[PDB]
């Protein structure tokens, strides 16, 4: 699809068998979801942005379906204000910015 | 142009008579610039992101050229780690996400 930006670019994703709403975020290197359980091993990591650093759990090689497109990659879980799909998965679904 | 997301989508902008590098950020409602001594009236604001809130100065009706496309609107100035172009100006330049 082509998504304009008058509204927040929120989309439905599927992950770990569950549906969630997430923001397509070209300003994020990584994908960060609100507190949730995911299967498998995770590693502690820290990530930063506006407002500073937070602690997250890093899950590797997680399948995520985004607006019907398949990605498999790193998902960080932690106290993010909103579920964020970052460039690590945006690239996998072929997302570009155009103007 | 078309901008892929393999790397951070940094582009050149012009604002208040300076050229700067800024991140095209579909996740950001607002445009937030690194500290700069911009003339004009401003109002205080608090904006949130990944790690919490920061205090910024809100300036209205500021002309901002993004990769040669003219825009004009609200710009927030404060201790962001990165100059970010948010949706308020991305819409003005006809920027879309496409996959």
């Amino acid at each position: 699809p082509q998504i304009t930006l008058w509204k927040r670019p929120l989309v439905t994703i599927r992950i770990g068998g569950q549906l969630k709403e997430a923001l397509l975020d070209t300003g994020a290197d990584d994908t960060v979801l609100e507190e949730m359980n995911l299967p498998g091993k995770w590693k502690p990591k820290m990530i930063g942005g506006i407002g500073g650093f937070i602690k997250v759990r890093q899950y590797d090689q997680i399948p995520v379906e985004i607006c019907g497109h398949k990605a498999i990659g790193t998902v960080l879980v932690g106290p993010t204000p909103v579920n964020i799909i970052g460039r690590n998965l945006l690239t996998q679904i072929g997302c570009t910015l155009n103007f | 142009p078309q901008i892929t997301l393999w790397k951070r989508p940094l582009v050149t902008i012009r604002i208040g008579g300076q050229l700067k590098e800024a991140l095209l950020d579909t996740g950001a409602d607002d445009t937030v610039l690194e500290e700069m001594n911009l003339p004009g009236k401003w109002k205080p604001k608090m904006i949130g992101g990944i790690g919490g809130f920061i205090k910024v100065r809100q300036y209205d009706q500021i002309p901002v050229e993004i990769c040669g496309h003219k825009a004009i609107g609200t710009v927030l100035v404060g201790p962001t780690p990165v100059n970010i172009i948010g949706r308020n100006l991305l819409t003005q330049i006809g920027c879309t996400l496409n996959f």
Binding site: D25, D29, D30, V32, I47, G48 | G27, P81, V82, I84
Partner: peptide, 4 residues
């Protein structure tokens, strides 16, 4: 930095 990472998540804006």
């Amino acid at each position: 930095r990472k998540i804006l």
